[model samples]
Target: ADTQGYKWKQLLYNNVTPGSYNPDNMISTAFAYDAEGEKLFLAVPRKLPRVPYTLAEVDTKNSLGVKGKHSPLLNKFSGHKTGKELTSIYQPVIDDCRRLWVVDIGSVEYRSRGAKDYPSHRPAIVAYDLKQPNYPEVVRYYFPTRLVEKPTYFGGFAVDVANPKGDCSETFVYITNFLRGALFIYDHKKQDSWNVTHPTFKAERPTKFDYGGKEYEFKAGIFGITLGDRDSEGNRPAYYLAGSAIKVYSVNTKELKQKGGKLNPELLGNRGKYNDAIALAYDPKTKVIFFAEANTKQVSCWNTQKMPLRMKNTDVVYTSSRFVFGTDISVDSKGGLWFMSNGFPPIRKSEKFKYDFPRYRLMRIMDTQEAIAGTACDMN
Candidate 1:
């Protein structure tokens, strides 16, 4: 017995404000410090008809002084209303200059009844400077030209900051399209210095796979971007791409290599049932790759350095029921992974109370040998 007890303290409860249930709001995406640690940044939706907000700081360690309030990090900019619902946010690295990248799909409502020809604009990839003392500041925003007009969804983003040249200026960002099978790439140096969105690479139609007893095509393009640093020399990390299939891209050579036809075939057990690769994270220390399957609520792991990429489907990780609507995930320095869901149940007022508000919660995976052995798991 490790003698530590897991404590669940309500961070934001109805008692904070009579009938206030901000903890149960729709929080679909999250980024954190430990692979399975507490949430450091959470993506929360703004009120309807307004642009959504991402990169909200959660002073879990009480370093910010404020006890219960959700510290607002980056707010929506002008021309972007707060009503826009945000799907995902990512922190590609754990560094002093680490940035929180926000992906906004422009429109909130997906296809709805009587909501035909909804006037939608291009999606945006906004970067929030994490170097700021207070809540993050919006440093740059890039809106990619869509191949199809009103491309309903702007999918997740991935960053490769650990370039082999040891040049931070060589960092690259990749964005996916949900409706059109297109992958857009942006060079950070060009965008930061010239203030332009230049496409370094574009894959109009990536490969597709069959899953869940149906041929779930990849027409929606790429949904998630994750870096695989299988070959990193010191501070320079060679990043690879994880697209619709298990294909990998070499940032250094500007080339793409197909990793057979499936990813983690052993863990998937059924190649026909496992199709899409939603999110990915590469742990340099462990040389392991972690990915999530949105439809199956399954999180699979692979040793990048090993042959056939044997899968280490953890015997302890928990998959939430809300994972069907999961958005994105990030791995922290401590070998822990954090994920979020955008369509979870909203916080409702208790029948005995008044006032109803949005709410969100952080689910931590305490996988330390001590945490697993002990009945208690205290983050502190």
Candidate 2:
């Protein structure tokens, strides 16, 4: 068994403070590493805007990228304060385009305890082309109100592009709608969007999971999602973990892109994939899927190249005692795998803020391609 593997490298500590944000002013659910720019883009949730921006940036040094220092200010993607257009974001996708694509959830509570948070704004994606001087210019697509229900925050998002060097206007973004249990696909080329959902996307039943002894309702469905590499046939499969049991599920990229009245549930491929996983990421080059297998307190690197998907205890490539509730996982351009450990579930609604305080981390294994290559699985 790969016992001592990807170890903890405390990038930042989410210290418990009176207000709502972590010390970095980022209650970041997800972040994208801009290799070319040599910066890490952080997505701060609107729930904890600590600052006006939903998107912020930090340097890639060994030090923590906190607010105030090191270009930590909220990078404006829209107007000041709140706007109907491109206001807030969660788990955006950053790639060679440097066009940080984000979906404004249409809710900015203003902290005035005002009514604007829910009743105001609309959901839309606003992408910023950072190469530009201002970088505020954006190409946007707004989703209709009738589309998703409340608690309908879209977090997991990924854009599919044939060739980064070529035109990406023909691209499609696959996003997850947790509350509604659906997959929202936005076709930039078509300037249209559709919801591909099934019962499988919803939670199995009333559930409760312990986070620092106290049980939380979880209330999440289909949060962790990632895409595998395109096969020789030009088909790429997407894997997502949804509902209470948190079983990993996969469906084809073509399936969601194709025009259908509504996708049939039978088209979904599911049968006890990776279990008890809250966060996961895909390494396209190595054809491996890394997971935060919470129960085992370890990260499993599954080689999708294997049949029935070779994920066993031995497949667990890394272990850590610091991990609490596995929140999010991301892979950089170079296949460096990283994950956010939010410690415990929210004490105020989300927190283990006390115990793991000052030590909370974003763990990583450099060059996941090499990490996976360095390990061995049963099938191999």
Candidate 3:
């Protein structure tokens, strides 16, 4: 009964024009906070008609007041609409070097009009240095068509910076290719990329689950990933799970970095009684991993310091009915916990895609330490 125990904020925007932007069409899946600039970056995949921008930015510190739940200002991430813009970015990751990383699926058709296959361009890894002047400088690495199979849906990313003090080029990126049921890796040092296939990456069915007293069905494969703190040998565990999975697994980054590495995944823990999850992120200061408990509509956490990581060591940090269809979660450098809720209907394909005003929301907890207090994730 710890409801209303924490402080949170719901970000709204008023700049999107009424007639041009169909609010339901803009389904925001992921977001990252830039502490250096105090900018909240959001990803609205070009899923439906009239999607103005795939990536957008909002300044939380300065607002022109709320105009009936909509803010006075909402702008695109500077330079996201340049010559080579992102087609559909389901998720974006900001590294220690202040670089925003994203894998554009290069298409925009979330079955809103059936599977007619609208190809925007070849999928590519796009990085932007947010610290740059005017706008972040862009760098793109396109994945060869032969490797990115048909109907590929990239869900999210986990950026691994070898060393914070090291050069930015040493960072390695891990991408969840949900539609392909595999993990894609890009080693910046080698300037090469590879895919790792595992049986656990694919979603399992009959993947029906209960939510808000109603039974719903969803089938999604490897969709979320995060990197744990580095160990003594400069290696870390990359925690990942499929959207329809009940368990979270981890593999050492050193082994994953190997070309065609032998994967021996260690089960970190379950999502508490067959619960499914979507996105994952780690907090270095608290040594905890935060993930969206999709079916349960809650943000749960696991304390890494607890050995034999099990349900007993996991706890719910935040829960809300508004968290329906939680798509992603991110932890900022200053302990801010963010979540994107697209508010999808239970039976999406059959039901009309309509919702009350503010169809989508970006939630943020001002402090993770305070939210985790007295919970299983509380290390103190």
- Which candidate number would show the highest TM-score if scored against the true structure? 3
The residue-by-residue lDDT of candidate 1 on 288-318, one tens digit each, is: 4555554455455554444333232222233
Model 1 stretches with alpha carbons more than 4 Å out: 1-27, 30-39, 45-55, 62-96, 106-123, 135-138, 144-152, 162-167, 192-220, 230-253, 256-272, 275-277, 310-326, 341-362, 366-380
Worst 10 residues of 1 by lDDT: 1-10
Superposed Cα deviation of residue 18, candidate 3 (Å): 4.1
Q: Which whole-number lDDT from 0 to 100 does residue 99 have in model 1?
A: 54
Query: Against the unseen true structure, what C-alpha lDDT does each candidate score?
Result: 0.39, 0.59, 0.71
lDDT string for model 3 (241-302, tens) is: 88877777888999889987698988766765656777888888788888876657678888
- How many collisions between residues are there in candidate 3? 0
Model 3, which residues run further than 4 Å from truth?
Answer: 1-18, 64-73, 81-84, 110-119, 150-152, 204-214, 345-352
Which 10-residue span in candidate 3 carries the lowest summed lDDT? 1-10
Worst 10 residues of 2 by lDDT: 1-10
